[PDB]
Structure formats: C-alpha cells, structure tokens
Amino acid sequence: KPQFPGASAEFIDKLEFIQPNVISGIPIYRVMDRQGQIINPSEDPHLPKEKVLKLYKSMTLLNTMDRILYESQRQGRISFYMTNYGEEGTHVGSAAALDNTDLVFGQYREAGVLMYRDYPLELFMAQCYGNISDLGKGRQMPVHYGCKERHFVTISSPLATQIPQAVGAAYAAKRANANRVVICYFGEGAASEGDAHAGFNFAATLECPIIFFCRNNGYAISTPTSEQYRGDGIAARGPGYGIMSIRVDGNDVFAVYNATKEARRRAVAENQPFLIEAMTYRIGHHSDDSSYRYWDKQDHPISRLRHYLLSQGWWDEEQEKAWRKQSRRKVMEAFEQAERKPKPNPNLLFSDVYQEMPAQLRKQQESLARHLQTYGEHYPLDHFDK
C-alpha cells in the first residue's frame, strides 16, 4: 500500500498515461428544449408565474437597454459599451436562484444580475454617462457597474482579479456565519489567467461557500476556444482542484436556475465551492467588429423562455407588444434624463484615492482650482457640476 502524504491511491504495475476525455466531455444539463418544452418532469423547478414573468421581463428590458446604449456609443454619446446578447438567461436564471443579500463579483456581462435585483435604469445610465447621479462619480469607463445596496461589487477591467477576491469574501462570510454565499462570474478567456488558478485552489483548501460561474461563449474577443485551452472546457478543471462541478445549457434559464439553486444550497451548508460552466454563444460583438467569425433564430435564451410562457398561457402577442413598447419608453426616459444631467464636480477627481485626502493631494486639488481660475475658458466647466 502506497504511503505517500501527497495523494491517496493504489499502486499500479503497468505504465499507463491518463488521457483527457475531451471529445466526450462533461455532458450539458438541459431542462427545456428550444421549443420551451420541459424535457424531464422531475427537473421542472415549477417556478411561480410572477417569478418567471420577472425573469422574462428582466432579460427583455436588458435587451432593450443594450440596443439603445449600443447605438448611443456608435454615435459617440457614451465612450464605450458591452452588450449582453445571448447571456441574458445565464444572468437572470442564476440571479433568481440567489438570496438577495448573496454577494456578487463579476465583470462585463452581468448587467442582467443587477437588472433582476431591480437596479434603476437611471443608475445604469448615470454610470455609462458618468453624470452627477453616478455613485461611482464618473471615474470608471461605461458598464463598470457597482451597487452596495444590491451587493454587487464594482466591476473592474483587469480580467479575473475578482476571482481570488470573491474567495476571500466567501471565507469572511463563513466566519461571520451569516448563511450567505458569494457568486463569482467570469468568461472562459478570463479563466486562463493565473488569478483563476489562485481562486479555485484557495476556495477548495480554505473551504469557502462560493459558486464559480463561468460563461463559456466560445470566444475571448477574436480568440476561439481552440486557442484558449485544450482540456474539456472549464468544467473539467474543477474536479482537479477538488471542486464539485457541472456544465449547463446557458440558453436555458431553468437549467441555469436549478444548477445555481442546488450549488447555493450545498455551498452554504457544506462550506465548499461549486463550479458551474454555462455553455452559451456571444451573439453580439465583443464591445470591435465581430465579423473573425444561428443562435438568434434557433437557440436564444429569450426566445426559449418566451415559448415556455406561451405553453403555460402566461404570455401572448398583445402582452409582448405592450411590453416592448413600455420597456422602450422606460429606457428612453432614463436615457434622455441621463444625457441632460451635468457631469460631477471636477473636484471629485481627487477624493476617495485614500479614504481621507492626503495634504499633498489637497495641494494638487488647490493647484487645479487656481489653474481654472485663470485658464478656465479652455475647459468644459459648464458641463460639470458647480
């Protein structure tokens, strides 16, 4: 019997290399087909009508906002934008399975989580426009959302940095014994970063209640997954870290919901991490003219959820028309209001660098004030607060 402390195993007397199983990888969990039909009754979550309608409306409201802000960027009204096309179901489905106070870390494609948590259209817009209503004070590029009230940690551009951070927040939650989980979203490209290896390993060895949620949409900007990794996607990496893992159909809100609900339940009870890899397809551009490269007319999360609603008698064409009209109205009202607000006071460029403001930093702020007194006509002072 092998006595090595590093592993638990039997001896083998024949030389055999372990081959990866990639052609036949971890199967994709599915609950409803492309026609919105429940495939296996025992897996139907039987979510109440009001909640399913909220899943639907959240993801179509997000889609309406995406269309409008995407165009706004094209016109140079906002400096940058990233859509959520094809990611709507992974976000609303997983957000619906969380408790309102579960802390969320993510990056660029999680707006739907905030939408499900009722983040105001006015605040999505304030951040993209960097106006006076932005609690982020206009400091970050557009779509770098954050909400303390809705436990959505501020997004940052450096990929994967939020992964080991989410693990630390989960360790602290374990200690506070508040029966809270942390969920951390990231794409399959970001999973190649060293920080992903750091977070996955720490979560397992430090026994943290965290759900790692990987959105695998086949591309990281122009890079196909064939150039991103050679194993069986990201799901197959979880067991190597001792992490309970699963792969789901990301265009199926119910598959996503069921996997997330069960992961949250076990993660909080057992203080162990879970990895969910949601297979999807980035329908829209990365940010970038996508056309280095079907999922809109044959396999779209919104379309599948809509068919499900119809089969239950929960939606119809007139309701569809009225909602498209109402959501467009709601989004355009927030948009116009956002465009008209002034930007924050230029002095806000100096606060929050440290909690307090160092004297030498105050001197730089005074320096600017003096500069503007004399050269102000050469600056856009009328567009900024005070």
Binding site: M141, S157, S222, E227, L361, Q364
Partner: protein, 336 residues
C-alpha cells in the same frame, strides 16, 4: 484632441503609428527566420491592427494567439529568447502588464546577470499600447514607465511618431537586452507621416533635441512631446521665450548627457509626463539634473505631471498635464 502632431533612408510611404509598427514587424520577420509574434488576439491583426496581414504572410507558427494570461505571455516569451530565437510579445494594454511584473522584474531583467551570462533573454521584446486616449479611464490609459525604470536589466522605450516608432522598435527587437516598447495608442490613427519602407534603426538611450532654444529646456516623451512642442510656440509668441524641446525617447538607460548639456546652456528645466507626479520618472531626471547642473540652475526644476490619483474617465480633461498647465508652470519658472 489635446495635442497636435506635425512632422535619407530610401523610399518612404505615408504611415500612421499602427502601420509603422506593422512595417517594423514585417521587416523583422522577413530578415530574421527565428522571430515570432504572439499574444492575445494578434492573429487576426490585433485590437489596434498592428499585426494585420502578418500571419497570412509569415505563417500561423510565427504569428499566433496565446491563452488570456499575461504572466504566461511574458514567461513564454522569455523561454523562446532563452534559446536565442527572437520573441516579440504583445501585452494588449500597458495597464494589463502588471500580472507579468514578476516575470519582467524578477526574471527577464535579471536573467543574464544572475547566470554569469551563461543564459539570457536578450532577444525578447514586449510591445504594448500606452498613454491616455481621452476616455480610457483607469485601465485603458496608464503610463507605467516609472514602475519599470527602477529595474536594472530592462530597457523601456517610447516613441512620439510613426517614423520614430518604426526605427526605435527595430532597435528594440535587435537589441541584446529584454526591451519594453510602449506605443502611444492615441497616435495609432492620428496623422501619418513619411516612413521608410525598408528597415532602419534609431539608437536607444539617445534623446532627440527636436528644437533648439536658449532660455529653458523642456523634456517629455510619447504624445507629451507634441504638447511641449506647442508650449514652446506659446512661450515664444506670448513671452519671447526661446525653448529647447527634447524627446527623451528611452526611459532607461536614459540619455543623461543630452539633458544636462541642454540645461547647462539654458539654465532652466521643465519636465512633463502623463504619469502621476509622485515616483514618476520626472523625479529621476530632476534629481540627476540638479546633481550635475547645480551651478547652472537659475530656478527650481518644474515637473508638470498627471495628479497622484488613478486615471479618471469623465474628468480626463482636468487630469492631464495639458499645454496650458505646462505653459503656466513655464511662465512662473521663467519669472522666477
């Protein structure tokens, strides 16, 4: 924008900055069979088009994409260079160079020294978009040169135009030391200029006096050179002040003699850079100049730099050391 671009080796062709980078890379792969180019999204031409057509021309084994992992990109590049092959790595935005900081500072920079020259990674070059772009905010705007300036063993080079970029980049690729080449991204598409089609080199560790002057010395690099060139014009017209304008070009090892020689003549110095004041590279130039020209300095050296804060989105117009800020400090310094 906040600057205006303006300005022997054979046939030339008009090229903007990104095209001049492609030209330098093309010349390199053509004359050096071992050279390869790699990084995130370089295969289809790059997010800033610097590698367009190179994969089709040289092969998928020479121009290829790596997984999304900066520490791996640099460690991988070091390894290619250790065998003597030319490795030209791309880091997508200079703001994302930090994950590779350990591989750069603890490994690349110390590779030759620590081995007694038994091994080296001299044929490694890391190129990366750099500097503000009007709305880049915290992570699409950084100027990390001062972090690298404190690391013996690497060279850090920054061009100010398409002509300068191709010549300095070919010198970096051919230099026998690991080099970091920062490409001012706001210039990628801004105004083209004539650039030789064939390879030529511009020396490293050599500053360029682009305009002689006798009243004060102005030093900058990258896009900021255009800002001080304009400031020189404003000073001459509004104050009758003759400005000597110098592009440093190489951050380390830097051209100490050119700067001191200029200050010995003018007796005044103003250094400017987008990067934050504290710990910025202007503090090193100022210290050194004070030590070499104490007798000639007629006034305190001034540094007009970005503020000591992260780079903001909506406040960028108020953050950058623009021509008015440089002008004002110059005015006060001239009146000292």
């Amino acid at each position: 924008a906040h600057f205006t671009f303006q300005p022997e080796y054979g046939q030339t062709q008009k090229m903007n900055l990104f095209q001049s980078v492609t030209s330098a890379l093309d010349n390199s792969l053509a004359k050096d069979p071992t050279a390869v180019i790699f990084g995130e999204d370089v295969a289809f031409g790059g997010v800033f088009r610097c590698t367009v057509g190179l994969r089709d021309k040289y092969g998928k084994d020479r121009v290829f994409n790596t997984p999304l992992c900066e520490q791996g990109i640099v460690g991988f590049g070091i390894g290619i260079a250790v065998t003597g092959a030319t490795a030209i790595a791309e880091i997508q935005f200079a703001d994302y160079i930090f994950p590779a900081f350990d591989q750069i500072v603890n490994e690349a920079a110390k590779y030759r020294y620590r081995s007694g020259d038994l091994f080296n990674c001299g044929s490694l070059t890391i190129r990366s978009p750099w500097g503000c772009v009007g709305h880049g905010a915290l992570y699409h705007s950084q100027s990390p040169e001062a972090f690298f300036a404190h690391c013996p063993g690497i060279k850090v080079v920054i061009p100010r135009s398409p002509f300068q970029a191709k010549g300095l980049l070919l010198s970096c690729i051919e230099d026998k030391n690991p080099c970091i080449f920062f490409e001012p991204k706001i210039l990628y598409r801004a105004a083209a200029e004539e650039v030789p089609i064939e390879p030529y080199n511009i020396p490293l560790s050599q500053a360029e006096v682009i305009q002689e002057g006798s009243d004060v010395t102005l030093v900058a690099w990258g896009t900021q050179v255009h800002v001080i060139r304009e400031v020189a014009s404003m000073a001459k017209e509004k104050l009758g002040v003759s400005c000597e304008v110098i592009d440093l070009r190489t951050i380390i090892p830097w051209d100490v003699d050119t700067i001191c020689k200029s200050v010995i003549k003018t007796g005044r110095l103003l250094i400017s850079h987008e990067a934050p004041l504290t710990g910025g590279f202007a503090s090193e130039i100022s210290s050194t100049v004070q030590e070499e020209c104490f007798l000639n300095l007629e006034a305190p050296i001034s540094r007009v730099c970005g503020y000591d804060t992260p780079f903001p989105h909506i406040f960028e117009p108020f953050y950058i050391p623009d021509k008015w800020k440089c002008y004002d400090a110059l005015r006060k310094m001239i009146n000292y």
